[PDB]
Amino acid sequence: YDLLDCHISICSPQVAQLFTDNFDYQTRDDFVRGLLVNEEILGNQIHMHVTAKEYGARVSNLHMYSAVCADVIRRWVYPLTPEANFTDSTTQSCTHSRHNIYRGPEVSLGHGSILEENVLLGSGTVIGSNCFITNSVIGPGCHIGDNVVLDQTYLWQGVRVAAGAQIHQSLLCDNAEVKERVTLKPRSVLTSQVVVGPNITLPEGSVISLHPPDAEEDEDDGEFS
Amino acid sequence: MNSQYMFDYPAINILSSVSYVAYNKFHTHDVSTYEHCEIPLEKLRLGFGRRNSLADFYSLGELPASWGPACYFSSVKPMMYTFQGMASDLSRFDLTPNVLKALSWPLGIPDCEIFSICSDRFVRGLQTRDQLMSYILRMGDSHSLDECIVQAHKKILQEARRLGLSDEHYNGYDLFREIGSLVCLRLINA
Amino acid sequence: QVPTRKDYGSKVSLFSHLPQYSRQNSLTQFMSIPSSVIHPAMVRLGLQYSQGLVSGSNARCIALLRALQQVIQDYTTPPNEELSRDLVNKLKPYMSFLTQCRPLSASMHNAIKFLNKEITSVGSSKREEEAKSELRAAIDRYVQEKIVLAAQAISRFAYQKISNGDVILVYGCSSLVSRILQEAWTEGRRFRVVVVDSRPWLEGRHTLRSLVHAGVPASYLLIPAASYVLPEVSKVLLGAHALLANGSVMSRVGTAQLALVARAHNVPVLVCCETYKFCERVQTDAFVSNELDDPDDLQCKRGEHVALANWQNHASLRLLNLVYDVTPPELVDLVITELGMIPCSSVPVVLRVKSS
Amino acid sequence: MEFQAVVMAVLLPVGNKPLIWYPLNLLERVGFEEVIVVTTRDVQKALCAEFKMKMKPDIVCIPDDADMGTADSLRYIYPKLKTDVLVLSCDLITDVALHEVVDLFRAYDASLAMLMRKGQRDFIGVDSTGKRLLFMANEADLDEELVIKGSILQKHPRIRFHTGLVDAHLYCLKKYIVDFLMENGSITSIRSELIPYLVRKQFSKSLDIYSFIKEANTLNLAPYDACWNACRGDRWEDLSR
Amino acid sequence: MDDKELIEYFKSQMKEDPDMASAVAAIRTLLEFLKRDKGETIQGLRANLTSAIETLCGVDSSVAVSSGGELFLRFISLASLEYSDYSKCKKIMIERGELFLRRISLSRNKIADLCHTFIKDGATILTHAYSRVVLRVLEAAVAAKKRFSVYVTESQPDLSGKKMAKALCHLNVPVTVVLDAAVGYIMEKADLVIVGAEGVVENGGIINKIGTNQMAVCAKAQNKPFYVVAESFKFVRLFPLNQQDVPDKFKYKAEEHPWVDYTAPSLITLLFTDLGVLTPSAVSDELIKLYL
Which residues are annotated as modified residue Phosphothreonine in the UniProt record (chain A)? Predict the structure, then answer.
């Protein structure tokens, strides 16, 4: 029970043949269970390889996404590192400092702001005054106001945040915007340019988007309808 | 360790009476003095300064080393309590409608020990300490003397708010004077 | 009588005089199951020592005192004999066997000396049950005042030094340090903690499990990287296994390294220890008096090969597993005891005042 | 004194030398000056008289009733119990250094220590270190699926299972186990119900159970084939003794 | 008796005898206040005494005042230890206070009659600021007909060094005033550096004038002897870990200009108190013995 499914498999063309014969099979788990219930006919023993010195995971939801981001920022998947720039792109050039403070080019940290630990800043970002950012990731080209508190959040490219906001454990998709005197509860989600109106505090489970039905709430200038 | 040295230890037995015993050695916690009574600050912390409004101290988790008439340099900025005359006059009464429920407070069962305490013929010597702490021990709901002091002051402040007595006039410099004044005003109110 | 544990593996020439046993070799293989030497309060404690079930010095002292309480309770006087001397003469083999299982520490030495003094102080006219009850009561009072109240007083003292927004460095699994930090965090102090661990015991993880369970922000790293983290460290706090009359500190192997590098980085050093742990004996190095654990713990599996697998087949090769070392007094700035906050040079003074 | 050797018999002095002599000798191989044996009464409550013709160091014999299991025998013999016990069986031919098993009872202060051997129907499951058993069941009470609780896997995420292992019916047991046996008459046999009850009760100041695995010898089982194998191996076993 | 009257009593006691130490005047003020209190309970004594202690500490932020107050309160506890009755207690308080005052009065001469034996003829003396104890021991050394050179720093915040230079020229002693930044340049020509102490911390380090620490470090670099003189009542149960750890109530009120520095015992050769010549461990021993 101590294993973790890395979703990595070594397969033989026999796997393809079994899939093209057994029509009902749809996923890997279905194939494994069907082979393990159809034992005597086409025995086809399945083998396992367990590793304990290297990292491997498969993101499938926001929980796994946050866990994997935290592990990656903390150099758990070395040599893969935000400052390693394994994809040779100019934007993702980074410098590594104490407490895993990753800084890109042209960050322009504001006076009085504090980067505590495990923080990555995209290139072109702007940070206000007396900001407190911890265990978070800020995409390139963002803009943050003064006295903003960010904890375990994730901001993609182009996100704009007004001064005085408090953000914890939420996710803000690209080109999103937040107005003043707004507090986000943990596990909140902002998607695809949704702007949250001033003077509102969203509840714990708060997923919003432009599309009306799927998102729990849809809006562009507020949270009350 | 000069702050930790205490002469008399108020042993606690649990209506909710204390007993002072000869314990002349350095204590494990800071000890404050009020009306010659020693309170071990096991739950609180020693505080300095001559700031008035004793509530200003335990609001920060602190308690003054010494205060009250027993201290010539009391750190609570003493005041007058110009309501004790009727308390002294009624002190000669006994435990005997609306009057009974008026003095049912503080314990909830009517009593008259406070007026004996607040009597004119009350010299606050050594022998007078014990019951006072026991009295305070009956006030609060705790097992530490400092916590009982804090809870009693909370009760005093909230009843003063209830009857509108301008708490800036009630700094808690003398607790028994506050108790007597409030009880007398409640009796005269009805 | 009890046999002698066989030394396992060759030893370094400089450490030829010290014993070195193996965890696989247990002395109980040559002893009766219904223990006939004396009642088996011996064997339980001896096995838990040899197999390393209990590691903390305070834990070792408490376990030894509980076992010896059982010894006293089960003990009965022989006819035509005096308890005050027969008890000690019978107890000496317990100490011999326990030393055979694993060498004793300063705390247990002090406990044995204190209990021997208590037994000697017992008169020859008092009755058996009264003597046993008073011995048990004395053991209980010793445990209380020398561990629990001492720890509480030391925590109260240490609460003063711990300032807001600072970084405190600890080392190894020490109950006193963990309790001090937990109580300090309870009183509203806000700070970080940096944990330094060392092979092969890796017991530092223990205190890490405590720190997260107390909600204290923490960091973890091995000993060699300490020189990398000290510049951002504001205070170093170390538990001690013993204090000597010369002011030196006998502790786990890495303590002296941390003290030296902290001095080289201009960082104050704190040593927290209880008065009962003070030992009158003195030494200037870790060679004269130490303990060599099982060298087989040094083997590690890197990749798919263990380099030290067949180390016995190389005649020239030698392995040492030190468990103790001596920190010189001049690198120590504090000793925090129930008596207060003292310098190292004042260690003998305590030994003078507590002796009478 | 804290171990009181106890011998169960519900046997027959078959073989070159009496069967009951073989385990009892082991007791005198390591101390155990005194030993308690319980005989059968369904056939005749006088086998103790026949056994009294041996030459062991010291023997104590106690008769029983006609129908009484091992747990029932312990229930009868409890008034003679004052400390931890070491229950054995007459049918057991082994050369085990007993000091290993009691070590599990000694070092870890376990509530139960047992001896288990690689046989050459009942499933057992120990942890990775192979000392503390965590699960045990029999196919009699299992229909088709073997059930494991979530909590045990939370505390122990790696369980090693053994199937063909054979018990030696040797157990170091604590006194409060005997007291609990006193408290409840629903228990009739140790192996059948008592041990699995404790194993399950380990997971509701807790219960520690340990088993030592051996690779040398089994007990002379009820089948005559086991008796023949024991007779064949007895010469080699007694060559050292 | 009121706090104001205490303040003028303390100030008058200071002004009448400029040679009196601050702690001596504070102890005299405390004894006089105890003499006229009309209290009845020992606890009432303790509360009033400690409150007056903070009052005087506010009046004068010197470490000596706080040390004297702590010593006074410990003396109160010691006197009350074995006197259940209060009147006998009070009389013993008064008589032991008289003895204590006369002994601390003679303490300076006791230190002088012992310290002067270390002044080698023809040697060089280095001193930091205007300390009365070092002046007294230099007077004693001169009385023994010894010849020596003296260098004194200027103590930039308040030029007490020039005042000491004047007081030494009054005794016909070769003295030279040197800048506070030239100590190293002078450290080569020195033979032994004697300095007074504002206060003594647990392990033997000294609380003193702000420039002391650098001089001690430089002297240790050149391996020159470094002697510190102080009285018994200047002992205190404080223990800084570095210069930052010193309480702010002693640094200031006596950009940023602290009046106080701490010197570690490792840079101190010997201490000269009325008890005798002491190693730094002896101070910790005395403090431990005093508090049980």
Answer: 81
